[PDB]
Amino acid sequence: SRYEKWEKIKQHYQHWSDSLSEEGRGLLKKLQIPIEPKKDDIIHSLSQEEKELLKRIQIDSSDFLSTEEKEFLKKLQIDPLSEKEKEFLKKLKLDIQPYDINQRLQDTGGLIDSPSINLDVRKQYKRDIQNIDALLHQSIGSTLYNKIYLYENMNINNLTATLGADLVDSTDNTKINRGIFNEFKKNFKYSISSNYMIVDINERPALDNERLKWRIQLSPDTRAGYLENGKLILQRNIGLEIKDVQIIKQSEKEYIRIDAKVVPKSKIDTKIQEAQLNINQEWNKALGLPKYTKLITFNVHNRYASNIVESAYLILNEWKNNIQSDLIKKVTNYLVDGNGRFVFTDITLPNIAEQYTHQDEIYEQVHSKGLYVPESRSILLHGPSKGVELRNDSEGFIHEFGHAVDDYAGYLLDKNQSDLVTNSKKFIDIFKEEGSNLTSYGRTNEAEFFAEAFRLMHSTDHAERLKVQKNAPKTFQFINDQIKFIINS
Ligand SMILES: Cc1cc(S(=O)(=O)N(Cc2cccc(N)c2)[C@H](C)C(=O)NO)ccc1F
Ligand SMILES: [Zn+2]
């Protein structure tokens, strides 16, 4: 019933559609099609000293910028890297972001009061989101929820950028990597929508690397609204249980079918909160910690929810396997002493309180794979993203732990000043000598060099550990000496 199904859903919402004020209609158009910044407005605002710098900058080169950002900055220039130009780019990237309601909701996971954007824009988002919420008052009904499926095509990179890089067979792009497919689906049991899903009443062909084809069954009380050309907008904050994930073929090309069922969001948050208790009990006992120490935090709000939860077990297992238990215990106890956390999340790190409470300047806020914040003594690990030159999340976690080791070691040396051990005169000299002998990112500064060397020294690939010894022998010696010192103290 291709056209029949469309007509009757449209009929169901016909009064709702007619009663929409233009203000409301503009809100829904703004939501589907975000407002891009005007390239000519941005350029007019610049001073040519900055424009001179902006020309000198190789846009396609940076690891700081997204693909979307790169294209806009490449398109705009038609009219390593210094400390000043990065400072410039930190501020500039704030002024080139589209007004994107659904992106704001996904980035914050619904926590829209998070101080990760300017107060005026934050309030504008808050207002539009509350107004959209009020528009979506009419549920789909018990007549329709059962007769209908709704469809959504998705890029795998929105769920996991790490697995997304390898999902499609490189030899033959008509095929899905079976091994990668398995990793993707293995722990995919539930999903959370914190923004407004825009779904198709009838399934569409998959365009532009959208290999994920969702088939979604609505709940009777699922609030929605009809959109032009056979689409529906769904309420935010709904839950989805994954019923089946299969490789399917459409037009001689392999895609992934994801069958999901709408459930209440409260139902899934319960699972996440129980899992948080389960993983803390496992690791409090394993770490010799008080029974009710809350060290591990799940900050989960988006569409790859269950995987963030499940991967946290695997990440911490790898962490335990590759690092001396005594080191792990001493450093973690130091973090617990400062109310630190292991935060596993699928919202952007600027929206994590462990960072933003200590970083008020938005241009100084960081989003990335992982982060260590000394002020809160916390490790933050962002699931959906792909770290630069990282294989996986585990290697990413160990690098951050290296920062914590750097932190704790500096504290032990001077309990009054509590600086990083990488700020010591001794290590700065070592960085000056061996700074360029390891990873490209390790060249950045003393802290990064230490964390990168630490990560490589505890890699599952023992060829990597021996490489540090051979290429950066003094760094290797220094870190091993820091580890001894931490453990013996
Ligand atoms: C290599 C590596 C990188 C990263 S990262 O998340 O991409 N990362 C580095 C990075 C480099 C370039 C662009 C971004 N936006 C982030 C952050 C800032 C970091 O150094 N955390 O301590 C984490 C762990 C790692 F091992
Ligand atoms: Zn780092």
- Cα–Cα distances (Å) from 451 to 83, 186, 406, 482, in that order, read 21, 31, 8, 13
d(CA 153, CA 345): 23
Task: Specify the CATH architecture of the domain 265-489.
Answer: 3-Layer(aba) Sandwich (3.40)
DSSP secondary structure letter of residue 144: T
d(CA 488, CA 404): 17
- Kindly state if the Cβ of 62 falls inside 6 Å of ligand 1: no
Ligand 1 centroid distance, CA of 328 (Å):
21
Q: Are 256 and 212 spatial neighbours (Cβ–Cβ below 8 Å)?
A: yes
Q: Which residue minimizes the CA distance to atom 18 of ligand 1? A: 368
The closest alpha carbon to 239, from 216, 218, 268, 260, belongs to: 268
Q: Are 241 and 189 spatial neighbours (Cβ–Cβ below 8 Å)?
A: yes
Highest CATH level, class, for 37-97: mainly alpha
Named by the residue before each, gaps in the chain exceeding 2.5 A from C to N are: 79
The distance from CA 203 to its chain's CA centroid, rounded to whole angstroms, is 28
- Kindly state if the Cβ of 388 falls inside 6 Å of ligand 1: yes
Residue type, 474: K
Atom in ligand 1 nearest the alpha carbon of residue 370? 6
Same fold? 1-36+98-264, 37-97: no
Range 1-36+98-264 has CATH code 3.10.20.30: no
Q: What are the residue ranges spanned by the domains of the chain?
A: 1-36+98-264, 37-97, 265-489
3-state secondary structure of 327: helix
Binding residues for Zn(2+): 399, 403, 441, 448
Ligand 2 centroid distance, CA of 284 (Å):
26
d(CA 382, CA 370): 6
Q: Between β-strands 370-373 and 378-382, what pairing exists: parallel, antiparallel or unpaired?
A: antiparallel
Residues 405-418: b if buried by 16+ CB within 10 A, e if exposed = bbbbbbbbbeeeee
The residue written with tokens 């080791």 in the block is 405
Ligand 2 centroid distance, CA of 435 (Å):
14
Query: What is the number of alpha carbons within 13 Å of residue 358 lying toward its C-beta?
Result: 12
The residue written with tokens 């009061």 in the block is 113
Continuous H helices in 188-304:
265-287
Pocket probe mutation, ligand 1, options 70, 315, 344, 388, max atoms within 8 Å of Cβ: 388
- Kindly state if the Cβ of 399 falls inside 6 Å of ligand 1: yes
CB atoms closer than 10 angstroms to residue 196: 24
